[PDB]
């Protein structure tokens, strides 16, 4: 009647053709208008298998964001192969908008509506949709920002928890606001993010008890990344076209998980960055004048589990990320493409 299949999708958005904002410009030419009033069909007595970690929809979204970032976030200096590439690097208007992903004729998307579906396994409550929900192509590491939330309990996602090389997506059920600001009035690159410590330490405690559920009640420990580039050893994200790097050591303070005020994380705006799209560093212009500010919802955490042989009663976790495909996985997990026959 139908079968799992991979096909070329098309996007839909409510982009405004009159906006200078780069996401709106990209979606104006790339996407079609949103369906005025769609309608999903619940599939009765149907159990379908989903695998968020082998979902072709993730690949296509990755191509879009790479395309969006290369058409509108071009740097002053870039390392293509072995040559240096000079070019203009004007400041842009940058604010991600939601993008819907739709199937062409002869195909359809199946949607897993199981409240606590972990992404890999069977799903007893399935429906078919013409398009997905509006996903914002938010590029970040360590913390997943401005995403959707789990409808009930926190969810631990991983193709396999035994494999310490597999990223862990902690899907939160209650956002924790992060308020990052580069003030108007010394060093024009100094910034900081403020986070509600009372709220964060409580959410982080509920994350430990959910991890205990998956690791034989072993003690859960959080540590800062052991090494790697600044884009993964720190919370890396883009705000108003500026690239922020924030020290998150205070967000994983083990003593405060069972200390609860305003956590001010040291941040820095960097002009020289290691591109997530592929290879090479990129150099941009210094930050814009004025008060640069971004308030985002922390809706998920990216974790890498230590391979401590499991002989110890502990289990250390460190904020991961870097593979931006994981960010799209956290939003496309409930979807999959099938072909009609």
């Amino acid at each position: 009647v139908w079968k799992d299949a991979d096909t070329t999708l098309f996007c839909a958005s409510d982009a405004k053709a009159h906006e200078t904002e780069v996401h709106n410009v990209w979606a104006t030419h790339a996407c079609v208008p949103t369906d005025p009033n769609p309608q999903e069909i619940h599939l009765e007595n149907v159990t379908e298998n989903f695998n968020m970690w082998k979902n072709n929809m993730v690949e296509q979204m990755q191509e879009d964001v790479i395309s969006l970032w290369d058409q509108s976030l071009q740097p002053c200096v870039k390392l293509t192969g072995g040559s240096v590439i000079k070019q203009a690097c004007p400041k842009i208007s940058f604010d991600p908008i939601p993008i819907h992903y739709c199937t062409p004729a002869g195909y359809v998307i199946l949607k897993c509506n199981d409240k606590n579906f972990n992404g890999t396994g069977p799903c007893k409550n399935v429906s078919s949709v013409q398009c997905t929900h509006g996903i914002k192509p938010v590029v970040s590491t360590q913390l997943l920002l401005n995403g959707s939330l789990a409808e009930e309990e926190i969810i631990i996602r991983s193709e396999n928890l035994t494999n310490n090389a597999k990223t862990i997506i902690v899907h939160l059920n209650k956002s924790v606001e992060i308020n990052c600001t580069r003030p108007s009035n010394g060093d024009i690159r100094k910034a900081y993010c403020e986070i509600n410590g009372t709220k964060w330490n409580k959410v982080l405690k509920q994350v430990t008890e959910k991890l205990k559920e998956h690791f034989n009640n072993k003690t859960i420990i959080f540590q800062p990344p052991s090494g790697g580039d600044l884009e993964i050893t720190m919370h890396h994200f883009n705000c108003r076209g500026e690239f922020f790097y924030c020290n998150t050591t205070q967000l994983f303070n083990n003593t405060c998980i069972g200390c609860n005020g305003t956590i001010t994380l040291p941040c820095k705006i960097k002009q020289i960055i290691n591109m997530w799209q592929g290879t090479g560093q990129a150099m941009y212009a210094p930050p814009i004048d004025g008060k640069i500010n971004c308030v985002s919802n922390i809706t998920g955490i990216l974790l890498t589990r230590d391979g401590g042989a499991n002989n110890t009663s502990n289990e250390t976790f460190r904020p991961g990320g870097g593979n931006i495909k994981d960010n799209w996985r956290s939003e496309l997990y409930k979807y999959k493409v099938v072909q009609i026959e």
Partner: antibody
Framework: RAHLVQSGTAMKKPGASVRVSCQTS????????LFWFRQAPGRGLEWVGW????????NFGGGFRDRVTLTRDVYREIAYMDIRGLKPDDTAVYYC???????????????WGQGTTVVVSA | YIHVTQSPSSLSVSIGDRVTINCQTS??????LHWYQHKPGRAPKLLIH???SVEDGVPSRFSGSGFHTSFNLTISDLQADDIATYYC?????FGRGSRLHIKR
């Protein structure tokens, strides 16, 4: 296609440190995890750690995080392993191997370096 | 921890013979079981990944089978190049190996 070549054998006293390097070629360097294993004489392969070259994310086996540093040069496509505080029982052949899986991780190692013999003796 | 045991540890073999060696697991492993060949002084070589998928370039006489906690590496029409130790692997856990030596 993929081919990994490691550095020559090392002679170190106790307490010293060592750097084993692993030059790669013939494939997309950042799309493949690089693992580090060692084999002491008579024993089986022991896992040291891995590194994802894209941003240099690392992970280690039992007790190796405290003395091993794993870095890479994405441009020269070469991976490094720095071991500090060498003990006599660190004597082994250290191997550099690549994951066959493009992007993801399967732990199936289809490309291997010839190995690097490291001896720690006073 | 996934303890990997291979039997027989040592094995007397003769050219042209069919050989089959077993690898067992502490826990259910499914199918991501990998087989390697290792000769002294050289680097190991990937023979089969995920139980039954033989790597390109490996002689067709190599084969793999098994599931869950028991996996077999089979060679039909053994040759002088197939004499070596053979490791099975899951994640970071390599087996001690099973060494072949010609029988006289």
């Amino acid at each position: 296609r993929a081919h990994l070549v490691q550095s020559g054998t090392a002679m170190k006293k106790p307490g010293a440190s060592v750097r084993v390097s692993c030059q790669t070629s013939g494939y997309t360097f950042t799309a493949h995890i690089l693992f580090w294993f060692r084999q002491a004489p008579g024993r089986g392969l022991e896992w040291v750690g891995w590194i994802k070259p894209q941003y240099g994310a690392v992970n280690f086996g039992g007790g190796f995080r405290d003395r091993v540093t794993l870095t890479r040069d994405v441009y020269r496509e070469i991976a490094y392993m720095d071991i500090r505080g060498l003990k006599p029982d660190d004597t082994a052949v250290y191997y550099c191997a690549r994951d066959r899986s493009y992007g993801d991780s399967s732990w199936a190692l289809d490309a291997w370096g010839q190995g690097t013999t490291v001896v720690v003796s006073a | 921890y996934i303890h990997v045991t291979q039997s027989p540890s040592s094995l007397s073999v003769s050219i042209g013979d069919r050989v089959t060696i077993n690898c067992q697991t502490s826990q259910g492993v499914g199918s991501d079981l990998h087989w390697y060949q290792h000769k002294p002084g050289r680097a190991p070589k990937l023979l089969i990944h995920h139980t039954s998928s033989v790597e390109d370039g490996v002689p067709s006489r190599f084969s793999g089978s098994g599931f869950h906690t028991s996996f077999n590496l089979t060679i039909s029409d053994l040759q002088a190049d197939d004499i070596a130790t053979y490791y099975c692997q899951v994640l970071q856990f390599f087996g001690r190996g099973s060494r072949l030596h010609i029988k006289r």
